[PDB]
Amino acid sequence: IGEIKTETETTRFYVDYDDLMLSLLKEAAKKMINTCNEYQKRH
C-alpha cells in the first residue's frame, strides 16, 4: 500500500506547478496508472 501512496503523494505535489502539460506530471501519472493496474491484477 505504501508503495502506491508514495507515487500518489508524489503526483499530488507535482500538481502544484500549475502546469497540466508538464511531461514530469504526465509521466508520473503513467507510472501511477500502471502501478494501480498491477495492484488490481493481484486482486
Added chain:
Amino acid sequence: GVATQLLAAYILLFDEYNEKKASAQKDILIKVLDDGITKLNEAQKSLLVSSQSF
C-alpha cells in the same frame, strides 16, 4: 520516496532560472520539508518511548 523525486525534479527543472514556476517551487519545497521534519521528529520520539519501555 517522494522527497528524492521532488528534489531531482527541482534540480532538473531549475538548472536555469525559469521565473514562472519560481514562486510555486518555494511553496512546494516549504511544504515538503515542513512535512518531513515533523514526521521524522515524531518517529524519533515514538522510538525513544519504545526503547524506554523495557
